[PDB]
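To whoever picks this up:

The nightly regression suite flagged Thaumatin-1 as changed. Nothing in the input moved, so I suspect the structure step. Input below, exactly as stored in the fixture:
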Amino acid sequence: ATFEIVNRCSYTVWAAASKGDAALDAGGRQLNSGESWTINVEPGTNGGKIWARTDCYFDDSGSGICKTGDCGGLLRCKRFGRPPTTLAEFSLNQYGKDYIDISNIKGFNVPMNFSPTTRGCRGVRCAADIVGQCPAKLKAPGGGCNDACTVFQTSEYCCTTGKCGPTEYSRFFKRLCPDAFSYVLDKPTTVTCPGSSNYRVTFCPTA
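Regenerated output under the current build:
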């Protein structure tokens, strides 16, 4: 499948693409404002994620740091990024269907559109100003809005027992982004696409 990753942000982001134990394609890249990065994702990719990273420094070997979504200091991600990270999440060719979603379960750093570029289902969007509205106790100093599980490390926020409810913090992300996951047992906002759909992830789809 092709993912076009477009930075519509006025600031540089470092796109990341990972299934948690491996890079997707090159796994990461600098996107200046307006730049597009086309990646190929293997059919059958299960638990694929795309995210933006903000305020990166990389040396000549692609080693360094980001204030948001840093994945063990690499330009080319093999691992998931450090929260806060708005997540484009995908499982491709699962019994003839694609599953896409946006998640705020690892917090929010960069507004995001995740849309098919092929026909047969709808995109999802989390483009509200979650960083600007972020509750004082979830504010990441580096930039972005932590989820309550990253900050407080409780069974309730992490949903560690497989049982828990919405929270004051999960409802803040849900109120600003109804179409994103807000907590682990949130009513699914997963969209079903045709198997082998293609996608665009847009950072700052409106701003």
